[model samples]
Every structure is written in structure tokens, then in C-alpha cells.
Target chain A: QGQLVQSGAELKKPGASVKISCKTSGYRFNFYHINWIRQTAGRGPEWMGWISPYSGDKNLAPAFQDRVIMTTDTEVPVTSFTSTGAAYMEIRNLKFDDTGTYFCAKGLLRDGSSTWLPYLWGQGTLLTVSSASTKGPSVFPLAPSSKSTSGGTAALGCLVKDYFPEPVTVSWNSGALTSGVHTFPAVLQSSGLYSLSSVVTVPSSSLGTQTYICNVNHKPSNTKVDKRVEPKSCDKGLEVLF
Target chain B: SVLTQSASVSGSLGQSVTISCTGPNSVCCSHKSISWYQWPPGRAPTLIIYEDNERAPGISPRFSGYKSYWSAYLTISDLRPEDETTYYCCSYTHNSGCVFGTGTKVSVLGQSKANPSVTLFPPSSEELQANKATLVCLISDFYPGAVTVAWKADSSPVKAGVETTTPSKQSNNKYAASSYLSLTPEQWKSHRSYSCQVTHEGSTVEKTVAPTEC
Candidate 1:
């Protein structure tokens, strides 16, 4: 069975409020409780609270009290935190510290019947608060050098760097792709920006004279970066024969 | 103020089990209200006892709660098969926000004869080079689903970058869980032996996978 899958990243201004959702499938959604967690750079995840999608009853962390509200939609099997849901935490009054990643986790309702250890986690949604920012990735490309022998496998990296107000996503596309793709988490840079890197592995035979596209979509930037993996010269054709 | 609790306790059917919860030092048990919640298998947790000694509306009379100087107790008498689950105690103060105990699991005897099957899946060569990789410990087909997962590098405990899922019920009435250990390529290449350890009941299961040398 599959785990919980969450919504994409969101970029909002201090005065602007946004709602994020955690959509789930696989097991009976109501059978399990879903907890929300917040993670900042270089720190452990903080328990934001949890919502019973079946009952809509919620418990917020004392740390979050009036600042975050938890709610759910049974029809969509999704849980959300909203300012409107809480009389206090309005998006317009958001602080720069509110920026971070929000993750929805499937908590195992253990012996206490309500205690949750958020075991299965979804890829988080990056919430960035920047009063000002650009609309697209500032830098995008496939690494100039690719490594793979004619008969063996090679790994290619798609890098998108120097972007503001995160919530960036990267995906790859090629014909009859046979290899698995892995994405590294977005790294926060010293310049108060974000960068993303994803890798795709391909058999050597699939590498020659072909183009692979790395598509980047960032909602906050309101732009898209489609970078083509330029074909590299093949000199190791004999490597495949050996 | 935060509340603390015991991790787990085992009891035979028809016996009694006492789960304890201690509130903050400044807040005495006499001045605070303590409540208990029970989570049955595949069901939402329900409040069993509230207000230190009063039982929740629908809770069984066998379930009772009491408070001492600085601690509270949730006692289950004539425990039933249905009582083999987790329990949590919550403390509330007039001005202080609510605090929850870490939680305690109650296991009854003769519930499981099966041990979990554990395996380790490491990352690829390319994944290592990028300073990014994840080691996944897949634990499958176990009974009495509640289990604890731990990690170690060589002989030292490795605590960071670990994520373990709660046991999910399988189609065959068994249980399964996945634990992930995030690793940098350097750590993967360091020649350290990585181990994923899972403890259930009295059995401790472990799987080891070494990283490719950098």
C-alpha cells in the first residue's frame, strides 16, 4: 500500500493568507489519524497538531494555540490549517518566522488511542514569506559532464538554483524512461534563497544523442524552467561491447 | 508544563494494569485535572476517564483514574482482550495550556507468535555521490503491531535523519512498517556498518547494510 501524498509548495506574502492540503489514499483514510508537522532549516520537526478527518475534531500544540488552526474535509480526505479556521491566525498578520515547510503525516494511533507518532510523512510544502521576489528560477541547467559507460549506467543531475520565496518542484521527462528518479530536498542558501537538485539514472545505451527535459515549476515565482539535458559526445562505444 | 509517561507495560488477560502520568513539578496533581484516553485497534481514541476520578460518559466502570501528590493513575481492572492498546493521560491547568503524556502501551499475553521480517534497502551509486541517500528498513508480517525502531552506525548510536512509520495492518492480518535513515554520501562511504534495530515484545530484530566506499 502507498503512503500519504501532500500538496505542492506555496509562496505567500506576510499579508496574504494561503491554505495547503494533505490528500491521501491507499488504506481507509478515516481508519488512521493524520498529524501536521512543521520543519525549519536545521532543526527537528515540530508537532503542529492533528485533525480527525472523520470527525473534524482537532488539538493544537500549545505552541501553536491561536496561531495555527487545523481542519479537515472528509470528502477529499484532506487536512488543512487556516486562519479562517482559527479566529486568530490570519494570513495577513503572518510573520516572517511563519516561513518553513508543512508536512502531513499518518500518525499511528497507538495505545492511548490518541497519541500519535507521525510515522509516514509526505513530501512537505515549502511556505515562504517574502514581501518581494522574482517570478522564475534564476539559474537552471544539466551538469555539463555526464558519466556512464556505453554498456553501464550513468547518473545525470538537473540543478535549479538562486530562487526566492520557495515551493519549487522539479520533474524529468524522456521517452521510455527505465530508470528511477530521486529528488534531493531543497537546500536553503546563505543568500536567503533556495536551490533544488534532482537526479535521474539511465542505462548507457539510452544516453547518446537524446534530449531529456528537466521541468521546474514554482508557484511563488509564477514561472517555469524547462531545461534540456544536452547530449554529450560518446567516446566509449567499446565499453558496451566489453 | 509537560507531562511524562511510561512507554509500555504488559499484563495477562483478567489482570489489572496501571498506567502512570506525572505532571509538571510546579503544578501539583491536587490542583490540576487529569484525563485518560484509550485507542483500540483500528479505531479513534476515546476518552475513558476525565477530571482526575470521574469516568467519561460512555466508559466502562472497570476503567478508573486517580491522582496522587504530583502524579495521576489510569487503572484498568479485569482487563479484557480489547484493552490491549495504548493509553494517554492529559493534564490541564486553569492558566497553563494542556499537556499530554508521552503515552503507554498495554499488551496482553498470547496475542502474537510471529516476529517481524526485517530487510534493509540502500541507495544507488549516483545517489551516494550527490551527498544524498536514504537507507530503508522494511519490517513486514509481524503481529501485535506495536514496535520500536532504532539505528546505529558501526557501534555508536546514530540518531539523526531517521523516520519510522507506525505499523500498518496488512491484508493477511499481519502488520508492517518502514523505517528510513537519511545519509550523506560521506556517511555512506565511510565504511561504517549501519544497522536498523526493531524491538517488539521480548524480541529484538536487526538488519545491517554497509555503504559503498567513497
Candidate 2:
């Protein structure tokens, strides 16, 4: 299973400023940037601005202005946003109507090319404008399973289901997966949901509680899956955590 | 008008020394864009600055290039270990790949004042860590109290993790520095773009990397 645990949803007052965060775990914070993307209900994603976890630079598309400020706390793998005056876009201030699902995306560079375009996305956060003065509180997702099974096979999967009219990638990450990778493509189901999956074979060191993760990468940003699978009983030197 | 540097300036690393780039016309009023380079022995000259105060695309801001009075100067505020290399100043004339200055060499003859600058080997995908990765940036050769590090990601300022620097000793007349920054495996796999910049003498130089790790 894959997931993109986002900051809690929000409600902002008209004319008031707001900030939201999208934190990524189960992967490297530097692999992809935390890119700000906006979607107004029916509309598709719009590139807003980007914040890098490394050098600390923020690049805003000409579209985003007084409306968005992207920042990151290097100590932590979190990317945050602050919005003012309806977040500027296209010389026009995005209206309260513009309030909808905004995502913190992860844009990957194209292989062997100068391509540095936004090509993956986050699961997205729903933003609604309200006459209410209080900015709404947020909720935390459930803690994922923490322990892993050793010497056993683990497969990480992404359920594109309805969202798969486009291209995407299912990548498995070991605590050791860094830059310049050797990746194998996952199989597609003819069931028509367009689900993608990738599996990384675990090393049989006869250990217990090892971690394995899967990230669902789509152009412009990313969605992820973190699983702790137990080793099959018959597997030699297999280890399992309580 | 094109800006050129004095063939050489002899100075110990971390000791203040002036690099003079004499140009055909005043670098200030004539040229719209300016740049500088650091060409150490056995290597291509790396561009250090451009357009006066604004950092050129990937140059570090610690390297500042200025054109004033009668000449143009690309000053590296603090002399760091890697700064022991060579330096060159250049300007964008009629087109890109502008002509460069003769060059100046900053030597860390020995470790007298500060620790030698860290030598950054060419970064390879393999050198990056699977869990977390760190990046180090250094600046050298500035007169104490003349420059500051202005690094940013995307465009926003980097927070608390920045390294503080020491000004060059007045007796020595040169400055030096080193900075280290780290990112998670996911971040490295994703954004892959980084720039180190220095600001001083009313100018900026930046060194950038877009690893594009496969």
C-alpha cells in the first residue's frame, strides 16, 4: 500500500493569510523538491512555487507571487507554505474560488536530459475558504506499521484506481536507495484501474525488523507506500518482529 | 568593453591580495554583464561571478565581482581550503562564453591561520548516501569584514544549519571559510538542484549543482 500523509486540512478567512505543510517520509527529503501546486476543484494542478531542502532556495513560477512563500526546515524533512492575498497567480490574485485541493509535489529531473520540469504530485490537501475567523485544526494520519520481516519477500504497491489516466512510477526504497538508481518497471493490471507496483528483493541476513518502502511517483510530484512485511515461515533464516 | 585581469597576483592563501582586471573600457558603465572564474592548476576555470552583484546561475555568492573606479575585481571574501586553487575574472562581451582574465593563484602554502579548505572531489552519484547526504561549500580570499554567505534553495534563504565564518585577519588581509549542508535520500532523489552563493564588495558569485542523479 502507498500513501502521502499530508498536514491536516484547513479553513481560512477571506482576506486573511494562511500557511500549510506537506511532509514526506519513507523516502529521501532531497530526492525530489517540495513543490507547491494548486488545483481549484475541477481544474488540474498548477505549478505554484518550489522550496529545496538542500541549498535553501525557493523558485516561484511567474504565476505565484505575494500569494505563496515556500520554505523548508532542513533539520526536519518537512516543506511548508504561507499564502497571502489569495496567492498570486498569472498577474491575477487567486480568488477564494481558487481555493480547492493544493498539493506539495515532488518534481523529478528527466534522465540523461536537462529536463528539470515539475513532473510528479502529492496526494493533495483540500483548502476551503470560510467566513469563520479561526483557521481550522489539522488531523494526523495513523502510524504506519513499524516492524519489517527479514528473508521474506515484500511488494510495495500503488492503487492508482481512478487517478490513472496519466503515467506514473512505483519505486521501492531501502534505507540505502540514493541517487542514480537501477530500477525495474512494475506490471499493470488489465482490470483497468491502472495500478502500478514494484518489489525490491530483501537480503537474507537472518535479521528481524528491517524496513522496506515503496514510493508512487507521478510526473510533477510523488505519493508513497511504507510496508513492514514478515518473512515467509518456510524461508531459511527468516526473522519476524512481534 | 571587455574586462581582463592582471596576469597574476602573488599572495598566500587566506592573505588579502588584490586581483586587477584591466578592461578596454570602464567595466561599470559599458558592460551589462560581468563574470569571474577560478582556474586552478590542471582544471578548467570555474565561473565565480557575473552581472556585478547578482550571482551567476550556479556560482557561490561568497565570490563577489565588482567593477568600479578604474578597474574590475572578483573578490573571494574568505580564503578556504579549496580556495587554494586559481582564480580568473571575465566579462560577457558580444556573446556567451565571454573572455576570461589571465588568472590569479591563491596558495595555501601551509596551515598558518585557519584549517586548510576542504577539497571537494568531483561529486558522483555513488558518493551520495542512501539515507542522507551532505554538501559542503567553501569560500576564500576576501579581506576580513568584506563579505557574507548568501545561500538559498529554490530562492528562499536556508535556515539555522549554516556555518559561521571568520573575517580575514587585518594583518593577513584575506578571509577563508567552509560550510556543510545535508539532505535526505528522498530530497536528493527528487529536486537535485543546489547553489552556493557569497556576497561581498557589492557583488555575488554562486556555485550550483543539478545532480540529476539517475
Candidate 3:
């Protein structure tokens, strides 16, 4: 019954600096350790490092060792919302391309049970080092083909295009569901826009008159876009239009 | 040109699984520059190896990283469920900008899959009045956390507001997740059948909650 919550989205200009904080609940914050991860929108994830709240020992990735400072506050007090303490990560001399989401994961000791290893994952804090405005995402369904239905599980997808500011959530339903769904990061396009896709696997038999619905939530635009897709069946001879 | 990697690599848990990211000589010249990351779909990537063979802090020794004349390799011995994800190799080249591999998906076997149970609940009258008609589909009692969910209205497909959450492991080691469907108040009053369909391990379970049931 533990939870780690990080700060909100940050809008900063190039050469500026920012500090993102993480608050913990349900577990003794200071007794355990916390680690940081940086996910650039276009590229993969970058591991920042870890810090011990109780021991104060820290380790940062080579690239970030000198640029980022990891700190912990044990004196924050214990409460239901945040029991014991909090952790802070500061990045100086921000680069405009440093737009990404920051995540904090719980670190369990070697002696403890290994039920959940490597990560429990923080709710993520978004930081965009840009002076531009946010762009709303355009949602469209990816039409499925007969090949997708051959495996008995139809694979359907939705494309979210031309969005900005890095905070977008996608949900899938015939009507929607989230787990077992696959989604990639918002890829930065050459034109400065961003694009992403989310996919879901469903039984081929599930699609008769019904279709899969993709819902996109982009907060900056205060918008929610929903798209529908009906997977192509294995029956190749016939075609119909709605 | 970018590095190349297979679409997938599979191995049983507790065994060894190796993947390679092949690239040009620029990426191969410096072993200390190549890095490997484990990225779970819809989730964040974790650094397993940095500076070629050096495992990140807190990463297990079973996860080994290395490089050859033309490729970077990541070998996970005694593979665990957490290792079942995507891996990408990256390096910086003076000639080419930052380059990354095409990503490899790993499947950890021996995880006896379990089926999930689906339960659908209708939105309360008060909720419909305040906001919209929302349906909650709770999927529980599942193992391995690999499950998909969909919704149906009046036995037909619905294509509007639907949201599913990440699966969270419970105290019993089973995974639980929920899906939400949002519709206009009038849509709910239409007294149509809204069903939540759940699929796990190739098997599916669907539960419907109509106005009659409400």
C-alpha cells in the first residue's frame, strides 16, 4: 500500500533550471530509497540515479552525474499523504530539447522480499523546456486488416498526431479498457509536432457490429478525442460500408 | 544509418536471453558510449546497462552488457518477469546525431498465465446528473498482468469515451485493473446494454450491466 507522487508539469525556457519534488505515502519514506528516470519525448528513457533517504548515499548516471543534483528531505514529517519524507531532483542549464517526463521508482533492499523488483513507478512529472504554446492531439483510428484477425485476436490501434507539451493519456474500449494495451512515447516529428500510437488486442469474435473506441485526453487543449475502428474479419470475399 | 535489432527475443524465466544491436563502426569505436535500456510498453524505460558492460546501480549482475566490433549485446541470465519488455541500444556519434536501435521485445516464459474476471458497474444517477454516464469495468483475480478490455453498447460497438488503467498487483500477487466508459446522460437513459469485455490468455469474459440491471 505505497504510492509515490511527483510534481506537476513545468514550462521553462532554455538555459533556465528547475527542481522537481517527489512525495511518498503509505510506506515509511525515509526508510526506503528512491530512484529517478527521465523519458525524452522522442527518444528512450534515461536513468538519472538513486538516493537513499535514510543513508543519504546517491548515484547518478554518468551524463547526469554533474548536471543533476539528487536530494532527500527527511524532516518533512510523517502523515497520511506523505509519511516520513520527500526526494528532490534539480537539473541546471536546461536545454530546449530536454523536454520529457520525469518518473520516480521505489527501490527495495536486497534483504527484503523480491515480489516487486526494479520498480513500483511514480505517477510521473512532466517538464517541457520550451517557450511555445501547447498543441492539441488529433485522434484517428488505424484500420485493421484481415491479417490482424487471423490470430483469433484482432490487433487494433489509434494514432494521436500533432500534439505538444508531453501529457497525453489514451484509453481503448469497444465502448474502453487500459491494461494489456500498448502505447509508445510521443515521437517528435521533423516539423516540430509530435505523434504517438496506442494499440489493443481483442478476440476476433468480439467484432461483429461493434468496433474499438480510442479515447485521447490532452489536458493543454482541454480536449478529448475519440475514434472508432472495426477490425477486418478473415472472410475475404465480401465487403460492406457503413 | 540507425542500429538494427530483431523484433523480439524470447526465453524462459531463470534462463538466459541475449539480444544484439548492430550498427556501424562509429558506434562500435567506443564501448563506453553505448547504453541499453529496458522499456515496457505504455510504461517508462529503465537503464539496465550503461557504458557498455557496466550495469546500472541496483540492477542485478545477471544482466550483462557488452559490445563487439559492430554490435552491442545485452544478455540477461536468470531472466525474471520484469525482464519481459523492450530493449533499445543507443550511442552518440560525431558524424551522425544520437542514434538508437530499432528496439527488441522480450518475452519471459514459464509465467503460467491466469485468466481475469470481469465485473461491470453502471454510473449512479447522481453522477449522470453532475457529469456524464460512466461505466466501470473491474478486472480482478489475474496473474501476469496481461489482459485486454473492451466495451459494447446494446450489443453493438461504441466508439466514444473509454479509458483503461494500468494493472496494479494486489497483496495476493494477483493483478487488478479497471476500465471506464463515458457517455452522455441521454445515452445512458437510452436503457441500452453496456457490456465490458475482458480478454486474458486468449480467453475472454464479458459482463453486461444494462438499465434493467441497474
Candidate 4:
């Protein structure tokens, strides 16, 4: 359940640059540094760079010494990468061969402890070296369910599924009353699409004949998902919604 | 010289724990800048001891740092729940830049502490337009003084124009710290939302605010 979800695919041309982001939730984003990797078919993942969310220290691979920039935005809870070329060097531009998948992997601390190295991974972002460009995935909501729980609380979940590119947002109407909802970032399915889920807890007294909604907005796609909650009989399987 | 640290270790409350750091050469240990840092879950690593065993001003007396030959040591005494955190050794050499030990985690059993209270101050229209705006993420009332800070623009990670202060002790023995993210009018206006995220002891908290137009 500790997850790191990355931004969606990108199509770039030679000389053009792109940055991908990985947003994390369910576990401490800074518990481990985020290490980026580049992978081509038939090759091992090439170490690209890493940026520590805790201290803001950045380290790069020799191959990416000056050709890549690693940074993190703690607010978005994401670590990101930008393709850059050496300032003094020319003609060593981003190339078509760079058309590979980029992934963010968790890394150990500078203390060199392998005990907590990145065992988790983000769904890779496919970077295609193409002539034309497009934006991120469209976002829509899945049916939400509500059930009463012990201690007069109701567990509600807003499932946002099948979206893309990167940078999606989800909100709940009742977030102010309790610990806010925790959104599981978009996870890549075998079908190659991404899905996200968010959950919140509310007092059962607030749920009788009440309507709650999950609002999802994606910046890259400029699309939004507004879905109504559907009441379902609370079952043991539904407890995992949170 | 290079630095390396132990992976992890554990100690009981009221017990003492020591972490080891090895260096490529003895210059670092002989140098005056050998230091130890503590990193708790989501917070930034803060210097507890520096300059060969001198505690940072305003730090608890329970922490001690030492150096011998080519190695450095960080020791915690009268271990508390708060002491169950990660530690790292750092040193500097004239021939090379600064080097850091790999890192060590110390887990103290049977201690529970409250999470920090977090607040966010959004930027105003006038400040935003003047390119002089700042967003503040304030974390306070947390035990053990370990917390991490982060900023974002429209859900994307933001790296530049961000600054975080080390955790400072409070009168009640809790800790408080703040992080600031500067913004220009153009960048502020272009983004729809910005946020502040703080982490402590594996629990994460966040606050988001939109930029107000001038």
C-alpha cells in the first residue's frame, strides 16, 4: 500500500525537454529518497539521479552528471526530473534513443543503509521521441460507497480511475471535519491505464439521507470528474476501501 | 574522503545506542568538522553534534558525538521514544568536499508521541503581484523535534525558492519549525494551487491554498 505514482507518458522531439513527477502517499514520502531510473528494452534500469525530500540534496549518475536535473516539491509530495544539457557542451542534445520509460524508485539514506532501500516503485512514464505533442490523461470518477463503521463513523471512498499523464487532484466535501482523505495515486494497471482512489471518514450522524461527492480535477488534461456517491450495504470486503 | 554508515540498529528505552561511521581517510576524523545528524521519518536531518563532539546549541543533552582515528560515532544516552530515529555522520576534508556516512536507524520500543499540528499561510494578492509573495508552512507542537517540509505547485514537486528552518525547542519541550516558499507574481498567477506538506514519525500532514489575484 505504500505507493509512489508517477506522471503519465510524454512525447518529445529532439532538443525538446520534459520533466516527469512522482507523487506519493500511504507512506512517508521522505522515509526514503526517490531515485530515478531510465530503462530501454533489453537493458537494465540505468541509474539517473536522486533528490532527497528530507534535506533537498541531489545526486546524479555520471552519465547524467549535467544532462539531468533532479528536484522535489514537498508540497506536491513529488520528486521530479528534467532533461537538461550541459551549458558549455553542444550537440549532445536529448536524442531519439532516449525514448524509454522513466521510473522513480526509493533509495536508502546517505548513511548507506540498505535496510530500507527503495523496494517500492512508481509506474513508469513512457517518454516517446515523437514530433507532435499531447497532454495528460482525462479524469472521471467511479461509483463511491458509504457504510457505517464502529464508533458512529462512516467510511466513504471516492474512486477515481483510468486517468493519465500526471498531476491529478481529488477533494472531499467533508475533509475539514476530520483527518482529510488520503488519496492513493494513480496506479498503472495491466491494461496500461492509471487509476486513483481516495477515502475519508465521517461521523455516522452526518450520513443519514446525505449525499457526498468526490471531485477530481486534472491540470495537465484540464478535465474534471464529478461523481455522486452510491450507497451500498457495508461488507467486510469494503473495509479495505480506506 | 568517502563516508559509510551502518544500516540499522535498535535499543530499548533508557538504554544507550551507538552508531558507527567509517571514512576513506583519517583526515575527516582529525579535522574539526566531524559531525552527527539525526533524521526522523519525514523531517530534514538536523545537526545534533558538530566540530568533534560539540552539541549544537539548544539540543538535548542526551545526544553525544565522537571521533576516533578514521571513524566517527554518534551516541544517544537515556534513550527515549524520540531517540528511535535515524543518525548519520558527516565530515569534511580539504582535498575532497564533504562526505556523509550511509545512515543508521535506531528504534526504541514502547514510546508514543503526538503528531505535529500544521498550518499554512497563503500569499496575498499584493504580495503575489509584486513578486514578493511567500507561502509559509508552519509545523509545531510535535515531540522529539523531527519533521520534514515540502512545497508544490499545482501538485507538481517544486524545488526552488524553498527554505526550511531546523526544529527549535519549545517551552513545553515540544518542537516547532517553519518552511517558506517564495513566489513571483507570474509564477504565482500561472498556478492554480500550491501546498505545504510536513512529515513526522511516518505520519504526514498537508495544507493547500490557491494564489489570490492582485
* Best model per lDDT: 3
True contacts kept of each: 0.00, 0.00, 0.00, 0.00
Order by DockQ, highest first: 3, 1, 4, 2
**Among all candidates shown, the one with the greatest TM-score:** 3
Model 1: per-residue Cα lDDT over A30-104, one tens digit each: 655567766554332355667666677676776677667666655443344211111111223566777777767
User: Model 2: per-residue lDDT, tens digit, B1-214?
Assistant: 2444565554545555557776665343355345555544322234455554445445565677677756777676555556655665644432222344455656544454332221111122333432334444444545433466655565666754344344333224345554444456555456636556766666666655444522
Ranking by TM-score: 3, 1, 4, 2
Q: Show the lowest summed lDDT stretch of 10 residues, model 1 chain A.
A: A81-90
What TM-score, over all chains together, does every model reach? 0.45, 0.26, 0.50, 0.44
CA RMSD of all predictions: 12.7, 22.3, 13.2, 19.1
Give the per-residue lDDT digits (tens) of candidate 2, residues A113-188.
2112233344555565645333111111111111134423322222222122224444445436433221222122
lDDT of prediction 2: 0.44
TM-score of chain A of each: 0.68, 0.43, 0.62, 0.46
State the TM-score of the second chain for every model: 0.54, 0.42, 0.74, 0.49
Residue A176 miss distance in model 2 (angstroms): 34
Report the number of backbone clashes for model 2. Answer: 72
- For each candidate, the alpha-carbon lDDT, in order, equals 0.62, 0.44, 0.68, 0.59
Using TM-score as the yardstick, the better of models 1 and 3 is 3
